[PDB]
Amino acid sequence: NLSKFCIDMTAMAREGKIDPVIGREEEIRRVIRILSRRTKNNPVLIGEPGVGKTTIVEGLAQRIVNADVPDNLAACKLLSLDVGALVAGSKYRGEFEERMKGVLKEIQESKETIILFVDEIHLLMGLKPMLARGQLHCIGATTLAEYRKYIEKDAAFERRFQQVLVKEPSITETISILRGLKEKYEVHHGVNIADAAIVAAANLAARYLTSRRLPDSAVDLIDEAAAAVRVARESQPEIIDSLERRLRQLKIEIHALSREKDEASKARLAQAKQDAQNVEEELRPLREKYERERQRGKAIQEAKMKLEALRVKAEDASRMGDHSRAADLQYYAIPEQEAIIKRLEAEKAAADSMITDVVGPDQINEIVARWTGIPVTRLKTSEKEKLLHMEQALSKIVVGQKEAVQSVSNAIRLQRSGLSNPNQPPSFLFCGPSGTGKTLLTKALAEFLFDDPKSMIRFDMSEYQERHSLSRMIGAPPGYVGHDAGGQLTEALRRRPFSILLFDEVEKAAKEVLTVLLQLMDDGRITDGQGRVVDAKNCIVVMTSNLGAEYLSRAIDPTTRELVMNTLRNYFLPEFLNRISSIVIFNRLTRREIRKIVDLRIAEIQKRLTDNDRNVTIKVSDEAKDKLGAQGYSPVYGARPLQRLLEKEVLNRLAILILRGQIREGEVACVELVDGKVQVLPNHPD
Amino acid sequence: EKAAKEVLTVLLQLMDDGRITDGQGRVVDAKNCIVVMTSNLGAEYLSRAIDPTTRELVMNTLRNYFLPEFLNRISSIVIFNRLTRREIRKIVDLRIAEIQKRLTDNDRNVTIKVSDEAKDKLGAQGYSPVYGARPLQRLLEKEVLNRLAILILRGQIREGEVACVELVDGKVQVLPNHPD
DSSP: OOEEEEEEEOHHHTTOOOOOOOOOOOHHHHHHHHHHOOSOOOEEEEETTTHHHHHHHHHHHHHHTTTOGGGGTOOOOEEEOOOHHHHHHHSSHHHHHHHHHHHHHHHHOOOOOOOOOOOTTHHHHOOOOSSSSSOOOBBBEEEEHHHHIIITTOOHHHTTOEEEEOOOOOHHHHHHHHHHHHHHHHHHHOOOOOHHHHHHHHHHHHHHHTSSSSTTHHHHHHHHHHHHHHHHHSSSOOOHHHHHHHHHHHHHHHHHHOOOOHHHHHHHHHHHHHHHHHHHHHHHHHHHHHHHHHOOOOOOOOHHHHHHHHHHHHHHHHHHHHHHHHHHHTTTTHHHHHHHHHHHHHHHHHHHHOSOOOOOOOHHHHHHHTTTTOOOTTTTTHHHHHHTHHHHHHHHHSOOOHHHHHHHHHHHHHHHHHOOOOSSSSEEEEEESSSSSSSHHHHHHHHHHOOOHGGGEEBBBTTTTHHHHHHHHHHOOOOTTTOOOOOOHHHHHOSSSSSSSBSTTTTSOOHHHHHHHHHTTTTTTTOOSOOOBBBBBEEEEEEOOOOTTOOOOOOOOOHHHHHHHHHHHHHHHHHHHHHHHEEOOOOOOOOOHHHHHHHHHHHHHHHHHHTTTTTOOEEHHHHHHHHHHHOOOOOBBBBTTHHHHHHHHHHHHHHHHHHHHOOOOEEEEEEESEEEEEEOOOOSSO | OOSSHHHHHHHHHHHTOOOOSSSSOOBOOOOSSSOOOOOOOOOHHHOOOOSSHHHHHHHHHHHHTTOEEEEEEOOOOOOOOOOHHHHHHHHHHHHHHHHHHHHHSSOOOOOOBBHHHHHHHHHHHHOOOTTTTHHHHHHHHHHHHHHHHHHHHHSSOOSSOOOEEEEEETEEEEOOSSSO
């Protein structure tokens, strides 16, 4: 009787050590009617990993034990065999083989009818289920991937089964199930939880965590926050502990000093006894109220515990049909237990402060923070405050094109405002000079809407001038050259549901690229060339250009802009150009913004000086700033090389003198332009 | 059929009044024993009714998996069908009569009358197109014996009574007569 490797799930249900799961109940009816079939009643669930599809199976069992059953399955037994440990732990497949045999035949020793759950049946391949369609049932579940790679291959074994699928949980499902789990985890923890805390928690858990799968991801992070709150609750206050440690030192000092003959010892000993009484009359109030609130939480825990105990005893008697004694329990303990609970909440709120049972969202926010390396200071806007400070925050990054950034902000407001076409995310055409922080501006928007660079991928339209580039970007069927790597943009979107789509220098991308990405953007979506499902209405798309610089005269006027847009609409499909939510105009960067740019750069420098103890101050003199701007000013590319220019100009001799020591820590890197070629004016000779 | 061919030949020989020398040496044949063999997975082929059709395929199967003379000297071949309603009723009725009698063995002697319609639901809950008469005894034991014990030790039902048992909301309960 080697059920040892298997657990009677039905018993566990009757044991009531399980957690009632919700959602996907129509799927429950689906698999139920499937088992009612005689054609092929042994299905497999199409299941993405990490969805706790387990939880589904157990919900099935729970409903099963409780008359929620087609009578044919009256006393069938869902059990649980750890197939993995069973198969892989066998150092020799023969014992594995005889294990398989014995369990198979003993299953046929169905003194009562049972139906075991099994997973990863492909791992049973690597054909011994010779009679699975007879004298046997199969509770299958996995992704469609395994079903294809192993099951779709075979004919008999596969055809013995049926396909059923469960999807990624929507927010609402998580909401409900977490509302459920609230009480359970509380009773296990004796702490408090805020609904909206859970809501925002699971929200951010979806925003991030894509590595792991909802819902159980949110569940576990909630549990971790809870235990953190529990660890703080379990600990006595640090001020008390420190005081008691001081008190132990004082007791030792008293025992040491009392045996001494000197009025110094005697005076300090009286002092020590006195302050012992002090710290005692101090902590013992707080210490005892700590004990008291602990007893309160203990009463809470054991009260909820006996509540669940008597309630499941009454439920057991209900399953026995003891409506008399079941109702006796229901109307002799249940609401009275609830009254106990109300009194407990009353006394605990009346105690209201060092320790709080509640879980401020901030805590789990810190958890996910060190899970992501970003402060929740960033994770609090819901894009709203991200907008209401967008202009200014972005200005603090780059400046000079207040008009352009202004329009960008307006249209992005519209996108967030949910009133512009959410299918087609607003798209934009950078058009002006080059080396203007152009790509820097792109990355700036990227982060400012995500606070992470991974949400932006480089895709220049220069490589994408042709339909071969079309086939490589949009992917291709198995029979074209733009398929083996998938498609660049295809996979790029396959990973992210939230990102910006860079289209650099689109005056290289031919009209056909315009039209195909029009197919895409018009609903922010097309069907990939590889043959999958892909939609990114949450993502962002932006184009760039610089042919308008040629218009620009060294000091934006609509006059020039007019002819620019003319040249665009006659170079690029005006209807496609109508998909651009805003033409991002630019002008000649005058010397003031460039001065401030170089100032920001020397700021990056001084702060990297701060990045170590080795930290002196730059003093870029006005004339130095201006001359270096004039020099590194690249009318071809604004001042894009000016940065290398400046760093190679100063930083070299700077570090030279530094590691030589001609200027030591904290002093001035007085950037004083000598003869137009500034020298790093040293301070310590040889 | 699970076994290998050599023992099949052995049993052929034995069936043909044959015997084989043993460790003690004396050959032994079933001079007055009663022999029988079993196959399977025919019923899955056997659709609802008995047809002629399926039996040809299954007898040819028996042939092409074994030896013709080995199928010879076999008296006959009888196959069954998945149990119907009438017969389910009868077999479970006699089963529960046996229940009543074996608990009457225990000095506690209560009479047992149950709802024949609840009995119908019972059998439908019990009969399987796979395991038929095997699980229903277990199911009836589960439903019955503990109800009996609870009622008798409860006084809710004592001797000289009728163990009335009725279906209520997809559930059939042994309704007592002396609640606490």
